[PDB]
Amino acid sequence: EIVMTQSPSSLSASIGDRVTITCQASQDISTYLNWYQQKPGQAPRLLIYGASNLETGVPSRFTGSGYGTDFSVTISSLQPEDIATYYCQQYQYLPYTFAPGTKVEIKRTVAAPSVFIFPPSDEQLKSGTASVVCLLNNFYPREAKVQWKVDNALQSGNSQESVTEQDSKDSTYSLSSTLTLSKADYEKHKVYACEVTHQGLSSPVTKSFNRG
Amino acid sequence: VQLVQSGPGLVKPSQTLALTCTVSGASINSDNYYWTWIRQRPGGGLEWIGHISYTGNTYYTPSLKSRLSMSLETSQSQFSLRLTSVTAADSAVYFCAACGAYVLISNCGWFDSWGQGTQVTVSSASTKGPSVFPLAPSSKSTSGGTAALGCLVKDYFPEPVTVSWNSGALTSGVHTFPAVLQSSGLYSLSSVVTVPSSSLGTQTYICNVNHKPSNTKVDKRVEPK
Amino acid sequence: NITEEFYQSTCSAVSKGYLSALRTGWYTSVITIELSNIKENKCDAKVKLIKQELDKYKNAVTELQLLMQSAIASGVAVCKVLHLEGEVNKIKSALLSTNKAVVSLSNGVSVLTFKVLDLKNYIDKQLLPILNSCSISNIETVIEFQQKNNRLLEITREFSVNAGVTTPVSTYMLTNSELLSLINDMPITNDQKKLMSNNVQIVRQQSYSIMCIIKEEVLAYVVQLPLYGVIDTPCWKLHTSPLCTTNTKEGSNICLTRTDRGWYCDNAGSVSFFPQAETCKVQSNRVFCDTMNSLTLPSEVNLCNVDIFNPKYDCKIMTSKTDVSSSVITSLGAIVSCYGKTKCTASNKNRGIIKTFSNGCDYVSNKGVDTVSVGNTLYYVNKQEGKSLYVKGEPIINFYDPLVFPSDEFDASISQVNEKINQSLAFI
């Protein structure tokens, strides 16, 4: 089985930049290398077939190069519609093998997150559990930190985060942190807060509510 | 060529996985067409499973040869895949794909056609429909002109869940997050919309959840206070 | 330069002055045509013509694919190596930036490789960008593809009607310029390079094209070329004809004919004898032969021409009592074996009959002679320039007593005939 190396693992570049991903095969595979583009929730899309040939319907700014063991794909000017993962795949020898991939992020100026906190719905409280959700909306870069304070007591191990993929419209991210408690524990305390730390904030921001 | 996949999302362990792909735009027996199967493990790369030729010749990846089966059903214009003695290591999104060429002198390795994919989860757990709770907007979720709101899709199995807002009329500002696997066996995800705050009380916001693995469709109104 | 001697005593003639070119080995080159993969074809009089050529190209590929479902033992061995995985890829890499390259195969054989036609490059830069605007308004792009594809169609035809093995090697397999440069790069002496270049038509006749593999857009056939490891040694051709007695009473005559007629060439202190005709090709005074169909004889075999009863080599003859008339047309004349009542003459075009043969075995040179007639069979003589020598001598058939002559020996010799004569005389 043929091992495929893709470099780099992930990259970020400004809009309009020249982006180049290289691909290396364990042994010579002639011109039999393809390039695929896969966005979240969708099947892969063939970009380049036969090392260099451009698939019908792909923008002209995609260029393929190489022969044998070393190949590369190049985006002449990076665009918002290119935020995806890129794979190279060989087909000289069966079984066909893919590379691990290359994530592509768009670089932009630092944007501070809009922080919102939601208390549990009364409908959920009947079931026996209580979930508090804290939302960080439209920030860049991706790196952000959220921690919960139930009556000024740092919580640990009862919260789960989730991050969106980079929005192609404004190149930002969103995050959702969910603090899960039982109804009994939830009604013993009064103040619930999420403390957000981000590079776009001069000092940490806190959103909290009462009546818990 | 158009490809549409049919298959179950949940499969019990040590069973057999049955997927079919229905082809449109070219005969299953047309020249130099190789019907390929590819699977993508969660958070990972792609793995080529095998293909079956327009004549019926089959190549299976050496790893899964003992457990793989592929056949052609020309009358219904579809080809199938069978993986037996499945375990939790076989949970992935299974992709129907096709390679075709006018003149072919090499392996057919370019996949210009794909299906949408089937999310196959292999667990001894049972399917469960989600419980949907509203995330009501208030002063703590208003920042100037716009206010945020959403719904919480909690305690379902298995993936995936489809979330809509106002039957599809509301699409701008919508952010549905990737699901998270909770400490129990079940999943949970959140969907959030940003909305002009002046519109609360005058416009209806309803969260449309569709979970096909359990024939579940839930509508929940999201209202202030 | 070509001379000839006729020996009246044995009714035979030796033509000498020829120079050898003996094929002793084989050189194997791998000739490749780079093909291509065509993803799609979708689309106007000019473009319609292009699509007809594309169909001929696709059909040719399919035919060659279907096709892939001792003199050439070496070529076939090279074809077997090409089927191993990765092997074709090695060639593809060697010929990436050049058309000529030496490639060592996986079994250690170092073969010369030659890309004679690059159809891959032509379709992927010219045609492929155009087949996915459909508007091709100049005639010169059409012409080049028709020219380049026509060769592929004929190569495919040849392999298709020869079960993958062709001879002579056509100019479709290897053009004159391609062949000439292949010869130039061969591991041979300048004398060998010169001989092959001045006789390219003979080289083609002694070569094989062996269809090998179509895999990974490469069509490859092996062209197996002769190696002439023996050059400029003397060669001679022995012609023989029946020698009979001429008694009046029919059926009372006995006959003798020297066997082993054919070409002889000096080779490494011995003489190479090629018993089956057509294996030698004569151009001018150079004679090209193939050593697999020869015997190696002591050089004393030559004595049968000067002294057929010598005690050192047992000259081969056949015997019979069938005194029929015939002629053997030689390099520089004609032997006439005229018996019974046959009228045998030699004539010139304009002068007419110039020699009338008497009963016996006789000879006439090609100087002033155009045809020879024996009975109702007209023979045209070869008119090449060269001097002949008539060596007079008593026909040796007169030295045998007809009462003890063995007329039923086909494969025989003087000593065997002597032995049998001795046995019949003992019982008398």
Residue numbers in the entry:
A (entry chain C): 1 to 212
B (entry chain B): 2 to 35, 35A, 35B, 36 to 82, 82A, 82B, 82C, 83 to 100, ...
C (entry chain A): 27 to 69, 73 to 98, 146 to 208, 211 to 506
What does the literature reporting this entry say, word for word?
To avoid conformational heterogeneity resulting from CR9501-induced opening of prefusion F trimers, we sought to determine a CR9501-bound F structure by using the monomeric variant of prefusion F. This complex formed crystals in space group P212121 that diffracted X-rays to 3.3 Å resolution. The structure revealed that CR9501 recognizes antigenic site V, but also makes substantial contacts with the F2 subunit, consistent with the results of shotgun mutagenesis. The third heavy chain complementarity-determining region (CDR H3) of CR9501 is inserted between two elements of the F2 subunit—the α1 helix and the loop that connects this helix to β2. CR9501 uses both the heavy and light chain CDRs to contact five discrete regions of the linear RSV F protein sequence that are in close proximity in the prefusion F conformation. The light chain interacts with four of these regions, forming a salt bridge with Lys65 and a hydrogen bond with Glu66, both of which are on the loop connecting β2 and α1 in the F2 subunit. The disulfide-stabilized CDR H3 forms hydrogen bonds with Asn63 and Asp84 and a salt bridge with Lys65. A rigid-body motion between the trimer apex and the membrane-proximal region of the protein was present in the monomeric structure. Comparing the rigid-body movements identified in the CR9501-bound monomer to those of the two prefusion F states identified above revealed that the conformation of the CR9501-bound monomer most closely resembles that of the State 2 trimer. The α1 and α5 helices are tilted away from the apex of the neighboring protomer, although to a lesser degree than what was observed for trimeric proteins, resulting in loss of inter-protomeric contacts between α1 and α5 and orientation of Ile217 outward to expose the central cavity. Consistent with the subtle differences between the CR9501-bound monomer and the trimeric prefusion F structures, CR9501 displayed high-affinity binding for both trimeric and monomeric prefusion F.
